[PDB]
Enzyme design. Structure first.
Site, PDB file in Angstrom:
ATOM      1  N   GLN A   1       2.658   2.448   2.294  1.00 34.55           N
ATOM      2  CA  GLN A   1       1.348   2.835   1.775  1.00 34.55           C
ATOM      3  C   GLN A   1       0.817   1.899   0.696  1.00 34.55           C
ATOM      4  OE1 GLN A   1       0.328   7.533   1.098  1.00 34.55           O
ATOM      5  NE2 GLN A   1       2.078   6.793   2.280  1.00 34.55           N
ATOM      6  N   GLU A   2      -0.506   1.737   0.670  1.00 33.11           N
ATOM      7  CA  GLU A   2      -1.253   0.960  -0.314  1.00 33.11           C
ATOM      8  C   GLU A   2      -0.725  -0.439  -0.522  1.00 33.11           C
ATOM      9  OE1 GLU A   2      -3.347   2.664  -3.658  1.00 33.11           O
ATOM     10  OE2 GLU A   2      -4.507   3.430  -1.942  1.00 33.11           O
ATOM     11  N   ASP A   3      -1.058  -1.343   0.405  1.00 37.88           N
ATOM     12  CA  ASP A   3      -0.716  -2.769   0.369  1.00 37.88           C
ATOM     13  C   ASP A   3       0.817  -3.059   0.310  1.00 37.88           C
ATOM     14  OD1 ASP A   3      -3.213  -4.760   0.304  1.00 37.88           O
ATOM     15  OD2 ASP A   3      -3.799  -3.486  -1.412  1.00 37.88           O
ATOM     16  N   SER A   4       1.699  -2.073   0.593  1.00 43.57           N
ATOM     17  CA  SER A   4       3.138  -2.358   0.608  1.00 43.57           C
ATOM     18  C   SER A   4       3.659  -2.399   2.054  1.00 43.57           C
ATOM     19  CB  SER A   4       3.919  -1.386  -0.267  1.00 43.57           C
ATOM     20  OG  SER A   4       3.886  -0.061   0.229  1.00 43.57           O
TER      21      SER A   4
END
Ligand SMILES: [Zn+2]
Ligand SMILES: [Zn+2]
Ligand SMILES: [Zn+2]
Lengths: 46, 263, 33, 134, 65
Positions: D2-5
């Protein structure tokens, strides 16, 4: 048998001490390396 | 014959394609995982370096060495080093290999997995020998040497599972599929126009029957019959990758049942 | 005739040694081709 | 992821996926103080002054230089050098605190003005860990 | 820089294959694709392994000592 230093260019063992001149026995070039420990190093195979 | 049945479609020295009839999905998958990680293999897990006149890093080679497959047949008649009573290792828990290599030739001299040689005593058990599936009989290029490029190593291979390091992975890739015609509705196929025409039909579509349009959904329908393909890397022969997969999983379940008895 | 300091040289320029060295000459000179 | 990972295959990571090789070269020179008052490369101990590093000197050879096989780690001394005065003040260069590794290549040469010139390379292998950017 | 032993993704020993792959292209004048499947590389995880590797070891050997 045992080597203090090794010449970098002509890879000729030089086994010198201090005040023996940092140059090589034949070619001039001072480059000189330190050549591996005889106290053998182990690695994990990962 | 018994509980869950089996039909071997195709078989080889390194690939078994079968059908797991009369099983639960959970069981068919638990077996998949066990084969992947939980089966014990023998792998190089200590590389003592003496000389490395190579272009390659000692650890690069060291990592590379473990990844070489070794005969893991009679592995079960070898203790895990960690459980043995010797300081570090011995013949009861480890196989010692020795690699000596030097560029005699003007042409590039190569180092192969065949070039490793067992120095420990195998006590008369099929273990340690590096796997050579190579036509030319060399198998796995460790590295290359020039003129006076020397390489001296001592390797200690020990028992272990892939859950600790993927090098102890006895299996390549387990192909797994159930319900080719989506009858169980375990997917909602993404489409542009026709889902059936867009998505390719698997080879397994011949082993089951097409649903027939005018037939309502079977809400009671459950998935047994799983089409699988277990591929062996070489350490353990394919038949055993399955067999030991079944015994390991049995032992895991057994330990739980056994631990419940101490309680 | 007379010396008036040293001028730094650009690698692979006219006055640099490497301008004329072949693939094999460089490897010999421990320089990347 | 999640979120750019992102999630990464550890089984693939073991097989050699995105493995790096990190090298660092530590350099030193024997300083000269006009009237031939020159520093020296040596493995020092106690002696009258006592100004010295926490880290272990026991890894250095008699030239005050580690051999290219050794596995260095903490604030371990990589180069042993000493300055006298008017005598063990220290001048030794310890391995970067954060770091750790294996001594790769050690060269001993001469600077244009005749001083002892030393470069020490330390090799390590970088495994793709968790905060690792891609 | 020297052929990886085993494909990262599924771990099929891609190690031995290299020399034989180069020989299929040079000698048997085969196209890369057919040559790959001839070595038995079926899945694209294994296929990229060989197809996409750059043997820098051969360059490094060109340096004398
Ligand atoms: Zn020389
Ligand atoms: Zn033991
Ligand atoms: Zn693969």
């Amino acid at each position: 048998a045992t080597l203090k230093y090794i010449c970098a260019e002509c890879s000729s063992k030089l086994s010198l001490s201090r005040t023996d001149a940092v140059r090589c026995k034949d070619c001039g070039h001072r480059i000189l390396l330190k050549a591996r420990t005889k106290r053998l190093v182990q690695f994990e195979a990962r | 014959e018994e509980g869950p049945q089996v039909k071997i479609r195709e078989a080889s020295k390194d690939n078994v394609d079968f059908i797991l009839s009369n099983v639960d999905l959970a069981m068919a998958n638990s077996l998949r995982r066990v084969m992947i990680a939980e089966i014990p293999t023998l792998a190089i897990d200590s590389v003592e370096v003496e000389t490395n006149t190579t272009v390659l890093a000692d650890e690069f080679i060291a990592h590379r060495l473990g990844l070489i497959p070794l005969q893991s047949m009679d592995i079960e008649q070898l203790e895990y080093s960690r459980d043995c009573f010797c300081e570090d290792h011995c013949d009861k828990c480890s196989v010692v290999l020795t690699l000596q290599a030097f560029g005699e030739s003007e042409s590039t001299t190569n180092v192969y997995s065949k070039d490793l040689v067992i120095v420990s005593n195998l006590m008369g058990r099929n273990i340690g020998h590096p796997i050579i599936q190579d036509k030319e009989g060399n198998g796995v290029l460790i590295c290359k040497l020039r003129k006076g490029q020397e390489l001296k190593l001592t390797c200690v291979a020990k028992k272990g599972i892939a859950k600790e390091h993927a090098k102890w992975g006895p299996a390549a890739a387990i192909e797994f599929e159930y319900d080719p015609w989506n009858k169980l509705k375990h997917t909602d196929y993404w489409y542009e126009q026709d889902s059936a025409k867009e998505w390719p039909q698997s080879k397994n579509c011949e082993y089951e029957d097409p649903p027939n349009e005018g037939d309502p959904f079977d809400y009671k329908a459950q998935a047994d019959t799983f089409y699988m393909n277990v591929e062996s890397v070489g350490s353990i022969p394919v038949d055993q990758v399955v067999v030991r997969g079944i015994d390991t999983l049995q032992k895991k379940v057994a330990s739980i049942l056994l631990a419940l008895t101490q309680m | 005739k007379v010396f008036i300091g040293r001028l730094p040289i650009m690698l692979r320029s006219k006055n640099c040694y490497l301008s004329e060295a072949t693939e094999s000459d460089l490897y010999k000179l421990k320089e990347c081709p | 992821n999640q979120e750019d990972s992102m999630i990464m295959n550890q089984s693939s990571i073991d097989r050699g996926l995105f493995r790096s090789l990190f090298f660092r070269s530590y350099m030193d020179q024997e300083k000269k103080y006009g009237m031939s008052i020159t520093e020296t490369f040596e493995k020092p101990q106690r002696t009258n002054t006592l100004r010295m590093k926490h880290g272990t000197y026991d890894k250095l050879d008699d030239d005050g230089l580690i051999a290219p096989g050794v596995r260095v780690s903490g604030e371990d001394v990589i180069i042993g050098k000493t300055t006298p005065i008017s005598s063990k003040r220290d001048a030794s260069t310890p391995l970067r605190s954060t770091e750790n590794g294996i001594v790769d290549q050690v060269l001993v040469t001469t600077n244009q003005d005749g001083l002892k010139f030393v470069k020490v390379r330390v090799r390590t292998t970088k495994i793709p860990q968790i905060g690792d950017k891609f | 820089m020297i052929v990886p032993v085993r494909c990262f993704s599924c771990g099929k020993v891609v190690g031995d294959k290299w020399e034989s792959y180069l020989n299929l292209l040079q000698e048997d004048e085969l196209d890369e694709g057919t040559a790959l499947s001839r070595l038995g590389l079926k899945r694209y995880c294994c296929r990229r392994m060989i197809l996409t590797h750059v043997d820098l070891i051969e360059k490094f050997l060109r340096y004398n000592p």
